[PDB]
Amino acid sequence: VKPTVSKAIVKKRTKRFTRHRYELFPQLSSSWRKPRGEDSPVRRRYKGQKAMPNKGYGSDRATKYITPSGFRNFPINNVEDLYMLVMQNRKYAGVISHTVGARKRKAIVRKAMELDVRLANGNAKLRK
Amino acid sequence: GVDLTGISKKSRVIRHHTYSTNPYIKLLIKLYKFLAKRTSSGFNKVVYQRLIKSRSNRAPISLSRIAVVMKRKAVFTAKSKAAPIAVVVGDVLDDVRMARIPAMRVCALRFSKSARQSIVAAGGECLTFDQLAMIAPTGKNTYLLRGRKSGRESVRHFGASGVPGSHSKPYATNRGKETKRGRRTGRSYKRKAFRHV
Amino acid sequence: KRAAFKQQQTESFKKAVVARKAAKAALKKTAYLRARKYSREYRGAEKKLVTLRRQAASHGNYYLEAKPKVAVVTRIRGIAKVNPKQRKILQLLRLRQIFNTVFVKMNKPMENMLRAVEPYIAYGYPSLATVRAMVYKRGYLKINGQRVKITDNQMIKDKYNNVDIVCAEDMVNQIYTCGKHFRTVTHGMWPFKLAPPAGGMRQKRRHFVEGGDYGNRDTLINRFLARMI
Amino acid sequence: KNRRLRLRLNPYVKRETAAAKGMRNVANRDARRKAKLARVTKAKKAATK
Amino acid sequence: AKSKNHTNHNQSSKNHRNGIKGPVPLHLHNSKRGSWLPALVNARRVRKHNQKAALKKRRERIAAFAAK
Amino acid sequence: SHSVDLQWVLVRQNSRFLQKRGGIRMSNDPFNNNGNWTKRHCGFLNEKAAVVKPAKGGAICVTVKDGSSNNKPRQTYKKTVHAAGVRASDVSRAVAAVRPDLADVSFRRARRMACIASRTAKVAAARKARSEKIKFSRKSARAKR
Amino acid sequence: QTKQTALVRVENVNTREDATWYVGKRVCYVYHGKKVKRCVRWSKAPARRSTTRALWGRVTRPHGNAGMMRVKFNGASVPASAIGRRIRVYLYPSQI
Amino acid sequence: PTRFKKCRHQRGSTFCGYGRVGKHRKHESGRGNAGGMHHHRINFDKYHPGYFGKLGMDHYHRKKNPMWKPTINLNNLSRLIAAEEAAKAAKGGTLPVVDLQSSGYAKLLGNGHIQVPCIVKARYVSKLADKKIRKAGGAVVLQA
RNA sequence: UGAAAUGAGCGGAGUAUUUGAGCUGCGCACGGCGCGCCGCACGCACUGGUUUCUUCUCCGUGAUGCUCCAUGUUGGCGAUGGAAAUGGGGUGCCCCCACCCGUCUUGAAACACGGACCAAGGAGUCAAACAGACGCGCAAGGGAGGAGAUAUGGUUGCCAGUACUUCUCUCGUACUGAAAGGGAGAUGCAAAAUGCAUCUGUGGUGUGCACACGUCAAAUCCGUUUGAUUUGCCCAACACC
RNA sequence: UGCAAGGCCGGAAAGAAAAGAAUUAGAGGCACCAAGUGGGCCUUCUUCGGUAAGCGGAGCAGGCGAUGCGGAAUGAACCGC
RNA sequence: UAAGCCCAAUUAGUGAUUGCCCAUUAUUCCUUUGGUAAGGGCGGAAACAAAUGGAGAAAGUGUAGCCCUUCCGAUGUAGAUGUGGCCUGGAGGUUAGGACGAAGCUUAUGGCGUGAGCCUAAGAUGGACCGGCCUCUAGUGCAGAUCUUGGUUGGCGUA
Ligand SMILES: [K+]
Ligand SMILES: [K+]
Ligand SMILES: [K+]
Ligand SMILES: [K+]
Ligand SMILES: [K+]
Ligand SMILES: [K+]
Ligand SMILES: [K+]
Ligand SMILES: [K+]
Ligand SMILES: [K+]
Ligand SMILES: [K+]
Ligand SMILES: [K+]
Ligand SMILES: [Mg+2]
Ligand SMILES: [Mg+2]
Ligand SMILES: [Mg+2]
Ligand SMILES: [Mg+2]
Ligand SMILES: [Mg+2]
Ligand SMILES: [Mg+2]
Ligand SMILES: [Mg+2]
Ligand SMILES: [Mg+2]
Ligand SMILES: [Mg+2]
Ligand SMILES: [Mg+2]
Ligand SMILES: [Mg+2]
Ligand SMILES: [Mg+2]
Ligand SMILES: [Mg+2]
Ligand SMILES: [Mg+2]
Ligand SMILES: [Mg+2]
Ligand SMILES: [Mg+2]
Ligand SMILES: [Mg+2]
Ligand SMILES: [Mg+2]
Ligand SMILES: [Mg+2]
Ligand SMILES: [Mg+2]
Ligand SMILES: [Mg+2]
Ligand SMILES: [Mg+2]
Ligand SMILES: [Mg+2]
Ligand SMILES: [Mg+2]
Ligand SMILES: [Mg+2]
Ligand SMILES: [Mg+2]
Ligand SMILES: [Mg+2]
Ligand SMILES: [Mg+2]
Ligand code: NA
Ligand code: NA
Ligand code: NA
Ligand code: NA
Ligand code: NA
């Protein structure tokens, strides 16, 4: 199945918003923490520092949540989940959950091929 | 770079949804939101905005007050014309101090069991807001009524009780306590009962 | 087939489309005849003053020009370190941002308002070309509290609901000649938001007669604004 | 600076432009220059005497 | 450890943030308590008669409306 | 006594048919023509409803609830099967006979049902050809009764 | 600095009127890499295959009074290792 | 519920809405009603006038049972009359008899207009209540 | 890339009209000089006259599209491959930027204090009294509590729950006085140191939603709708009595 | 029949002319319940003590504190914003 | 023969009144977010099978926002508030997954979100439990307290 065509995806920013000084401490995770320090160079918005997330970085609502394939990801856990996406097969692609086993995945991949339902993580051999 | 000092002071606290969890209130708001925006009537707009209001701001009304204000309208009303429908966005409560009331059509969110009995026993009928929208889709010939709020004990305690001219009730659990100094001329001073404003 | 309620709408909308084309032609004809009369008034007024100056000069006399009635005021300073009195005048003049421009009447009450906030503004006496260029290129109306660009005379006719103001030439005439609807026309407009003067200023901190920018330039404001509009 | 918007706002702009074209005509400009100076000089002399 | 004694610096800025609200109109809070008593007692007798006349006028209006 | 307007307010946020997975609200509703969690498409909740369903072969079945037997859940929904080769506008007309606000989605679904039937036959035929060249160690068969 | 726009000084262009002649012309920076990678006509012209590479742009406007130009490169910005290196200003697109 | 409190919003704030200057210290004003006549006088004087001092007599061993005396008014007497009995009541005829002490009342007060005439048995009565109920066709009967 | 092209620009007609410059008619304004002659640069009215030159002007397509997406040309690359692209990830390097975090503080990059690393742990909680906002039930009444009853006098457990009851108790419906003690309707007639009569009724006044008869201004697709406003009643409130 | 006051009944209302003859990014009022503050500091002008001070103390107003950005090489407060 | 000081210009007695370079400013364009926001549509117009134009259209505070058009604002310490905002251990419901591999663990492992985070992939890891949604609940989120406990650690093959 081909996805519905949209406008170009812009992605205002690609780099992650990482925590300040997280590279100098193995303790600190890379995830974003708002600096509330009084003399924080990042909080005061100096020129050479790293940026802060805010509203202006939000992505265009037309192309938001759309994956590079052109679909939106909907997590499916068995064969019966594939039947919600029969009418919206050009908008949504199924994402088989990680914990779904190889025995159950065989029936999901077989069914989605006949229904013409895209799977984001099916076997690469099928669909050519 | 625009000089907009005090532009947040211009803005006001306007709520467009109800905090109420009642599903039937949400059906009345759904119905009267449609009527307010699709009809030219100013009745449907006032009713819709009062449905959003909180329980404290939708004060209850008594059956006696409805009877009194409808009689003031009953006089100076032509005999050919029918009496209006009393409409309250709130609760209608019974009054034991009025035994005899006229036959009135009253629409409300809630009627007490005795108020509903008293209205019906006098030849009237207790209406409902979707019943009103079907017989008065624009609110023609109605009486929009409000309950009283100034007699509430919270209102009578609001304000400092120790400033001149203030007759606020003190927040006290003991009535004998807090009665001496600042309350009697003999005991130091007395809070002045009058101030010019 | 079509539903009954859908058929009534089709007939009702067909008459609205016909009446919309009719009103478009009526206002186009009205705006043509009004603009023809306005342009003839401007030209004859120029010729009358030319002859008066010639008649006065040929007998040793002088001709006194009428004092200007309209001034065009632009804000040439930012929004930092403004005193409370100067701050309020610029708010009452609707000059709350740099390079914001308004038309004002040069009467005694307003002339004493402009003198107090001189270091922040640069005013002068506009010409017909200046008034036309601001209304046509930079003209916006306050419609339902929104800033809407003037794109046809139907918006002008609806915004003002006055027989004397139905077209963009009516707005130009009211501003240029200081008509009876000068305050109606100018208040119903958003303040003009201009670009910085191409080629630059001289010195925003000194008066024009001092070698700067912030005073009254008389009719020299028109070439200052031409680089901005 | 746009043709549609100028004509939409000013239906009479097609005639102000035609008047400006004739005023910038070299033959018209030179003829008017000769006539304007002669008729003002004549009226100046007549008033003087 | 001496400190600042007194200043009136940001005080006008604070007093004008929520404005200096204008006075109450003359038609509101025009109480006559504390005024000259002989004129206040005489005005009470007139106001009592005006209330009697106000009730009588509305009774006549009610009867007139029912008449027509 | 209890309307769809009231019932929708009760079930809009929690229902066994509502699937909010990763931010998307879908529906397992067997009587949903679309999969969207909206009042119009909640066919289990509306007084009258119609849904296009597949049948054996290329046939298309329209399951219709007309509100006559809503208190009898075994008689609430009736199935009428259209033979293979049926026009999708005829199926959309069968849905529009009870739900005129579902005629556009029922035409699109009756076409998908026919498209899926053809693709399933082609996918199955390509699977049979591939399996013919494979030797399998086991083959299960459910005993007859 | 704003790396999205580059400054190019061309030989014998020493006036602002000189640099206006080149507005819209194609500008190219030729360098080389380490490995032979894909080029235009990798298959049609195998003789073109080389470590040589080019980055293309266009002249947008002059810069100053002395014949400088502003150049915008296609998509990306020119590398800072190109500073002080040769730039090719072509005679097309032609206005003559 | 703990998940609804400000502590869950203030995770990461490091001060929890108490400031870097003033801080959340232990007992910065005293404990309880300390300093009501000094340091807290303005709060006590303007919000609780009358708090300090002595007033009146002392009633050792107050027993509240002897001084039990609930009141009901004339316009509220229909609360103690059954609906069918109130409908049948009329001036000059058979009237329902109301026992106040069995209903929890001792004194009849007599504010407003009486809605249904009745015979009221009360321990006490006002002069207005006694006068008004007689003019309306009822009566008060003293009881103990 | 024409998936509604509103164009002086697209399409149909036509070879003209008009708007400026010349030149001019009468009257009026205007300017010398004086109580009407001269001038008039060519202003205003006749939207005056002439056409010497200068311009193009006149019609036209609603959505029976509620919303989003989907339609060029020429090369290069890509013909199913350890491939061609595009994005992401990694490492180095150029040119520019760029003081150390937390913390008191008027002011910290500070020659101010705590800071070798990591893992696990670590700080607005529970109870009671009161208040205000919001949700819910009932309402001049609301509600227990303790305890009993029996489904259960049964069941390992579920069931320490749920279901049921209270002439009680409590908080209100009345407040004042230190206390003894008293204890609040309106109208009418009248002036009795507890006055009489009636009771379908805002104590009065000013301002005040909706509603009801109208009346104006504007827009109408001619059905109306949106603002104002006279009068009546004014609800909630506020202010004087 | 005059004055004072509370009303009632009417009238008139460029709804405020003309003389430079206002302007407004002008929804006014009214509550309720709460937090941080309650060490400040610096400037243009006025200003007191001191020989003066990067000194102590005030007035009107801006600013820093709480805020970066572009400029004065550098600089909490200067200049632009 | 300033690249210094005072004055004065803008390609120079030529024929008119913008030399040039730098902002988180101004104008304008695209996108996000929030309004004291302003409006339209929402009674499915009609027609239309596959093999060979599509899909959606919720009467709506807040979501992947019901959809479309329009206008304005957006920085901020202490502080307040909101969030169909993220995360953790348990409970009442509902719906799923797992020996064809559960939790946990690892990552040049990609995708999505402004973010807290979620999800997928691989394990040449593991070997038995556990995910989503609504509601309830609490010993519920760490970078630092000369913080507590355990381990490690440069100094250091040094004194
Ligand atoms: K405390
Ligand atoms: K091609
Ligand atoms: K550097
Ligand atoms: K501080
Ligand atoms: K000082
Ligand atoms: K928006
Ligand atoms: K459920
Ligand atoms: K699962
Ligand atoms: K840790
Ligand atoms: K650390
Ligand atoms: K340790
Ligand atoms: Mg903070
Ligand atoms: Mg710090
Ligand atoms: Mg700081
Ligand atoms: Mg795993
Ligand atoms: Mg009361
Ligand atoms: Mg300068
Ligand atoms: Mg300055
Ligand atoms: Mg101090
Ligand atoms: Mg149809
Ligand atoms: Mg706090
Ligand atoms: Mg403190
Ligand atoms: Mg004593
Ligand atoms: Mg044409
Ligand atoms: Mg310190
Ligand atoms: Mg210090
Ligand atoms: Mg620091
Ligand atoms: Mg130091
Ligand atoms: Mg210390
Ligand atoms: Mg009380
Ligand atoms: Mg302190
Ligand atoms: Mg600098
Ligand atoms: Mg901004
Ligand atoms: Mg902010
Ligand atoms: Mg989760
Ligand atoms: Mg736990
Ligand atoms: Mg790594
Ligand atoms: Mg803890
Ligand atoms: Mg330590
Ligand atoms: Na990202
Ligand atoms: Na790290
Ligand atoms: Na790199
Ligand atoms: Na009780
Ligand atoms: Na210094």
Ligand code: NA
């Ligand atoms: Na600054």
Ligand code: NA
């Ligand atoms: Na909603």
Ligand code: NA
């Ligand atoms: Na915006």
Ligand code: NA
């Ligand atoms: Na956690």
Ligand code: NA
């Ligand atoms: Na921290």
Ligand code: NA
């Ligand atoms: Na070592």
